[PDB]
Design a protein around this ligand. Structure first.
Ligand SMILES: [Mg+2]
Ligand SMILES: [Mg+2]
Lengths: 270, 65, 259
């Protein structure tokens, strides 16, 4: 088949591959990795900052007019306010420090607040997940179509524990135990961007997590949607854009998850 | 390389075995709890079945009170 | 250099090649199936062993105990650990091969064919990943630790006990990992990629190789009460001695209520 590429997706892939190379080289020789603690069980390295600089440099050589948003730099405002690049330079920093090789670079581009193109890149497996709004999602050029589960029976649900917000621990454990009455099993990998890519690829059947930040899920949301799935908050509404309480999967899995979870929700999660 | 009193006083450990353990660096009851059965192999007179019973008893005392 | 290790590696890599070729074929969702990949991998492993050691006993999940005339040596095999991951094309699974002589495990292999990561160990000689020596995690207690685990999907009568154990450990450790391969979870404890591991009701081929990797990298392996009966019960706790002690202490009250 004939291959093509959207110009902003081309630059997003270029930036993610260059940052990913730098990350993988520092994995193999971690003699110069220097870690620092942000908050509770939350770390940032010198590798994170070098990857971020590479991504910003790549974007700005081609689109100096565009706004860029990251966790460590905040909002670097540009003259064209309609476009925003939303970046996570290294998702999975605890895995990286421990040399567990599951981590990724995440880049989303939004026009007027709506996601248009997305990249999630695993530099250890060389797995490039891409999506363009209205044109589908891909892994290494192959089109993604999600899971075909019709309810929770037999399903595998990806998730993250609230390790940075343990005031939610009791409620979260109750939600997991209640879901386990109907689903088969869970996966907990330590990269939310790759967990959402795996929902899009059908490697798991759904995902749920409390309190993610915007760059954690901006790219993975478009992967899920272009592969036939939906994203909602824990009551089925649209407020995940503000709270980061995320549920994702095909429409029948998400409907069944929400029906199971409804009576275990705390006020804060409502 | 001598044993501590909590090891010498453990039931089934004779003075000979106590000193054989201490020779391998297993000098206290808490050190014995940390061993695997493989760590105690080739001790004259000590079966694998007794090695396991001694390590279990050390853990019951030191780890589980 | 152990000759048996050489053969175990050879069998693991041949089976891994076959698994990776079937991973490239259309999955159940895409197809919208007659070749048992576990069974074809099992056949490659048994053929490789028997061509070098025709007298030895072989034990696997697909075939049970294939008795040899030399009952002093047993090969304990999981031809594909991580079947659900393979079926959904989640690329985390492994071949596991252990050799036991007169009741003691002497050689271990865990091979990840998608990452080309070969974990090996021999008794009294240490454990390695692709040639590099493994030394486990340095954690001195559970503060900040990452614990690998599996859910009792084959034994859901234990669901409430298990969820209670996870919830109490979470008040002491930082987080958990649930990967879908117990053999690789144990290999990751040996490499320090996670700080420890616990799971209910595993079978001997699931952990026979991984548990020697842990112990040759400085760790201990016990049953859920702290004893040595895990090969019989399949309830496994593994990590360095400080991490294991802290896990067992945390879990104990819930186990008493269950029994
Ligand atoms: Mg990050
Ligand atoms: Mg298997």
């Amino acid at each position: 088949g004939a291959m093509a590429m959207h110009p902003m997706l081309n630059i997003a892939v270029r930036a993610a591959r260059k940052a990913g190379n730098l990350i993988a080289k520092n994995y193999e020789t971690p003699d110069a990795v220097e870690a620092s603690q942000k908050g509770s069980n939350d770390f940032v390295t010198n590798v994170d900052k070098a990857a971020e600089a590479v991504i910003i440099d790549t974007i700005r050589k081609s689109y100096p007019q565009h706004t860029i948003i990251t966790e460590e730099s905040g909002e670097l405002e540009g003259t064209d306010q309609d476009v925003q690049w939303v970046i996570d330079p290294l998702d999975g920093t605890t895995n990286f420090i421990k040399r567990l090789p599951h981590f990724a670079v995440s880049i989303a581009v939004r026009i007027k607040g709506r996601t248009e193109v997305a990249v999630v890149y695993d530099p250890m497996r060389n797995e490039l997940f891409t999506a363009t709004r209205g044109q589908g999602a891909q892994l290494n050029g192959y089109r993604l179509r999600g899971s075909t589960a019709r309810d929770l029976d037999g399903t595998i649900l990806a998730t993250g524990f609230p390790f940075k917000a343990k005031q939610y621990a009791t409620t979260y454990i109750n939600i997991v135990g209640k879901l386990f009455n109907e689903c088969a099993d869970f996966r907990r990998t330590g990269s939310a961007a790759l967990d959402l890519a795996y929902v899009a690829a059908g490697r798991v059947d759904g995902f749920f997590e409390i309190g993610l930040r915007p760059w954690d899920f901006a790219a993975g949301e478009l992967l899920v949607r272009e592969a036939g799935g939906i994203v909602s908050d824990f009551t089925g509404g649209h407020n995940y854009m503000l709270t980061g309480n995320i549920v994702a999967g095909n429409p029948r899995v998400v409907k069944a998850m929400l029906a199971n979870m409804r009576d275990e929700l705390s006020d804060a999660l409502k | 390389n001598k044993p501590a009193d909590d090891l010498l006083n453990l039931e089934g450990v004779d003075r000979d075995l106590a000193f054989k353990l201490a020779a391998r660096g297993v000098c206290t009851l808490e050190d014995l709890a940390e061993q695997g059965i493989d760590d105690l192999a080739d001790i004259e007179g000590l079966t694998d079945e007794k090695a396991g019973a001694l390590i279990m008893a050390a853990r019951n005392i030191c780890w589980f009170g």
